[PDB]
Amino acid sequence: GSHMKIYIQPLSVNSHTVEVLANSLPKIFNAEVFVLPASDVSLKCYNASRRQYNSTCILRMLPPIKVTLGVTGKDIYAKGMNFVFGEAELGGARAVLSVFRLTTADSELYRERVVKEAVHEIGHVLGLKHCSNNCVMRFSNSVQDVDRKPVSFCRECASKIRY
Ligand SMILES: [Zn+2]
Ligand SMILES: [Zn+2]
Numbered sequence: 001g002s003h004m005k006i007y008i009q010p011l012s013v014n015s016h017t018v019e020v021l022a023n024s025l026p027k028i029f030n031a032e033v034f035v036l037p038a039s040d041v042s043l044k045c046y047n048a049s050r051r052q053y054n055s056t057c058i059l060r061m062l063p064p065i066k067v068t069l070g071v072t073g074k075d076i077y078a079k080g081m082n083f084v085f086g087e088a089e090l091g092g093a094r095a096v097l098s099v100f101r102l103t104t105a106d107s108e109l110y111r112e113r114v115v116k117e118a119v120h121e122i123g124h125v126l127g128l129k130h131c132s133n134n135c136v137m138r139f140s141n142s143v144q145d146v147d148r149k150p151v152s153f154c155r156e157c158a159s160k161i162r163y
Contacts, residue, residue, distance in 0.1 A: 004031040006067050006122065011041035011058065013073040017099055017114060021071065024115045028151075029122065029161075041072045052077045055087035055096050062094045067125045069118060070096040085117045085140060088124035095121040102143060113143065116151050128157050 045057035131137035135154035
């Protein structure tokens, strides 16, 4: 049979974080998941004034192969935002996640946050808009938001992925 493909591109991030995603995403998306060789997040995307990397810039440096998720440990932002957790091509091929704003001394919680945000961004790539249900596709702009939504897709979003 056929399966969705997810390529994880490590971009200046620890290997542990990558492995959390490698081991969680296959079952969530019924996907063949591939971890690409690590590289440094591009200096071309560094904004010297903000001292942050731009998410749109990083995303657009990835190869446009559905679905490729860049994962970085560096703080990222996007136009008009103090920071973002990530960015995605809605219905496209590419997304990026930063774990910088997700860090926490609660190691189990950190893992949960990383999976939630990866799942959310990949959901956007698959064409899902933000959702008002108890759903991972709820908008998140703070970690409290992330902690208070579940990791699972609601029945409406799950349907849109599957059919
Ligand atoms: Zn979103
Ligand atoms: Zn939903």
